């Protein structure tokens, strides 16, 4: 039973919760069956549950699915809840454009988390600041919301339900994309968002236009990485290895250094 094992709190459809077995903080996410796009098996479950199980492990860069329940009209997902947290969207809203040292640490942690997803056969398809939680005391970032994800494949994708302003121009123009290169595009949008204080593009014409204007002082090295991730042609984009070998990405802070310097 679901109501007995957890104390359900108010809204955060995600609710705050505590696991009665040990007073562990949890997030209780409810997903209505009628709105579920893709299904998979593990036992028929939402694709989101499949992907969350495949990435669940000791690696602290992705949100951990602790348990799940099926109800007549919905599935209930018990997710870990770090405290204290703030999502990266609210963090950037309040603080504005982040120092490049902080953006480097955050972006590096997102890269490691996305690599973890891909290593586990999972494509997130909705990388954005809203879907990233910041453990304010440990300086560790967590990728959340796999509700738009899919199994990682090397063939073309012709469906997409993530966030359009983070979607790549080949999706806008031709409604097709490949997983890793579309992911790198969204990471370019995220990095610009970090160092400039907001995303670069709002309209489709901007997404496909191929021009990146910097509204903030950003180093030549960081500008180059962003423009490389935002190459119009997917094959012109860097691999994850090329991103992490890029000159701007060197000498990253440790997560605890990041918290002590920038979060405490």
């Amino acid at each position: 039973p679901l109501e007995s094992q957890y104390q359900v709190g108010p809204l955060l459809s995600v609710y705050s919760g505590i696991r009665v077995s040990d007073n562990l903080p949890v997030a209780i996410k409810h997903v209505e069956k009628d709105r579920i796009s893709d299904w998979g098996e593990l036992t028929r479950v939402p694709m989101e549950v499949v992907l969350l199980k495949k990435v669940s492990s000791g690696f602290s860069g992705v949100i951990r699915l602790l348990d799940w329940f099926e109800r007549p009209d919905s599935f209930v997902l018990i997710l870990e809840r770090p405290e204290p947290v703030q999502d990266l969207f609210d963090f950037i809203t309040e603080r504005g454009a982040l120092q490049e040292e902080l953006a480097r640490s955050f972006f590096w942690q997102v890269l490691e988390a996305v690599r973890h997803c891909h290593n586990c056969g999972v494509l997130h398809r909705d990388i954005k600041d809203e879907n990233i939680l910041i453990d304010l005391n440990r300086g560790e970032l967590k990728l959340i919301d796999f509700g738009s994800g899919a199994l990682l494949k090397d063939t073309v994708y012709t469906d997409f339900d993530g966030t359009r302003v983070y979607s790549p121009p080949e999706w806008i123009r031709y409604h097709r994309y490949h997983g890793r290169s579309a992911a790198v595009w969204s990471l370019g949008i995220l990095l610009y968002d970090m160092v400039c204080g907001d995303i670069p593009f709002e309209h489709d014409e901007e997404i496909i236009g191929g021009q990146v204007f910097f509204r903030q002082r950003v180093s030549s090295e960081c500008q180059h990485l962003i423009r490389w991730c935002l190459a119009l042609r997917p094959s012109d984009r860097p691999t994850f290895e090329e991103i992490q070998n890029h000159p701007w990405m060197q000498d990253v802070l440790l997560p605890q250094e990041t918290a002590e310097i920038h979060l405490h």
């Binding site: 954005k128 919301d145 339900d161 966030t163 907001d198």
Partner: peptide, 9 residues
């Protein structure tokens, strides 16, 4: 400049 969230779904 209006910074805003963008629903996915």
């Amino acid at each position: 400049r209006k910074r805003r969230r963008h629903p996915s779904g």
